[PDB]
């Protein structure tokens, strides 16, 4: 995240997707065995290349010695053509906790009110020297679609300040609160620029594929 701030605690639904022992991009935990992330995040098809890291504040896990969990990627389930969505299945299931927790998903079809305050988290490009490795967050506001196309029913518009998610933050969640419940409403996919001010980001609307997600969870069984 460019022009964010470091989180004070480690966010519980955040997953560091590790590609060849390097953090490639982000991912949000939604079930004990299921992670939701973006298509652009899997260059290879060999499952042994990937791990998933949970319960970490630091991307190398330095701080969080008593809370990290490393899980192997059992299977990739690919979203519909055009979704840029990938539901990741884990070999052994995540052990839920204070440092590891699920994030709720929105009702199917919902339109989230404009000006709703939201957030993006990720261990990606800071734009600065000496990235302390600590998870970062930027504060966004839902906006109108016309404010972005200068849109499909699978995309939402959110902007700030000149900040946002960048490379390394992809497949991470857009998180919003309504009626005192935080859900994951978008998922970070590469937009035109990085943190360009007055240029809101495009996120793939989780609420548009939310029914798809349950079709998978009900179908692809876990050992």
């Amino acid at each position, epitope marked *: 995240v460019v022009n964010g701030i470091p989180t004070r605690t480690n*966010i519980g639904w955040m997953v560091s997707l590790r590609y060849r022992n390097k953090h490639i991009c982000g991912g949000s935990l939604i079930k004990e065995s299921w992670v939701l992330t973006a298509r652009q995040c899997f260059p290879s098809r060999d499952l042994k290349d990937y791990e998933a890291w949970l319960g970490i504040h630091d991307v190398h896990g330095r701080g969080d010695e008593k809370s990290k969990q490393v899980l192997q990627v059992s299977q990739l389930v690919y979203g519909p053509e055009g979704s840029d969505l990938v539901l990741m299945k884990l070999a052994r299931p995540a052990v839920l906790d204070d440092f590891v927790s699920t994030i709720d998903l929105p009702n199917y079809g919902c339109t989230i009110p404009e000006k709703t305050s939201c957030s993006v988290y990720g261990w990606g490009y800071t734009g600065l020297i000496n990235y302390d490795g600590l998870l970062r967050v930027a504060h966004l506001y839902i906006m109108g679609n016309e404010k972005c196309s200068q849109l499909q029913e699978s995309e939402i518009c959110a902007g700030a300040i000149g900040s946002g998610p960048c490379e390394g933050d992809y497949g991470g969640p857009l998180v919003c609160e309504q009626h*005192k419940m*935080r859900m994951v409403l978008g998922v970070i996919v590469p937009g035109r620029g990085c943190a360009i001010p007055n240029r809101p980001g495009i996120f793939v609307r989780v609420a548009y594929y939310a029914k798809w997600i349950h079709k998978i969870i009900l179908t692809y069984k876990v050992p």
Partner: antibody
Amino acid sequence: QVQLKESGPDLVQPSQTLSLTCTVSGFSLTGYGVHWVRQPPGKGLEWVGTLGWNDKKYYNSALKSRLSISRDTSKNQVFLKLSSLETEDTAMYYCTRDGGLLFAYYAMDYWGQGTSVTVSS
Amino acid sequence: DIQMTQTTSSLSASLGDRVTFSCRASQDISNYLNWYQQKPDGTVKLLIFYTSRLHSGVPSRFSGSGSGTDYSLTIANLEQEDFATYFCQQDSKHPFTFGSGTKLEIKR
């Protein structure tokens, strides 16, 4: 909207135990933390302590041995308790909210109006 | 205990002045410093979180600036409502601590 109000007594006596209650609305104590701050008459603000979104408790250093904080998520309230009261605990007591998990900072971004609390015999 | 020193107790100014307040920490706080406004009726508002980030409702004439131990807050184009007391506070280590405050009075 985010609201907080403080509501305990306004006159208690030395060696007693103060019991304040913070009644929140608009957010859920599960995704947000609450902070107590006091202000002796005429002085600047003093941090009292905090209850985090995950029920972790941190206390002001001079007060910690007679302080306590608790919460009922169903009753939307956070409870302050200060044992063995001194005259010098006379102060306005506010309660405040975090950024919680949505905003992930520890700054107090919403503030109660306060409630006066006086200690003497 | 991290000691936030705020050396100036009051500071007199007039409408339209650029006015600055500052804190000095007893140790490196790494930009974990916040600023609040206490109005004469005792109302407290959050002005700035992190060293420089501006809160959602705060009118745009406020800004932040600092690093390490020395942080500061300024108001360009001072307006009448801005006459209040300004407090800083560190988030580096528990327990959070405040500064003695700076009361902004009106010059005469």
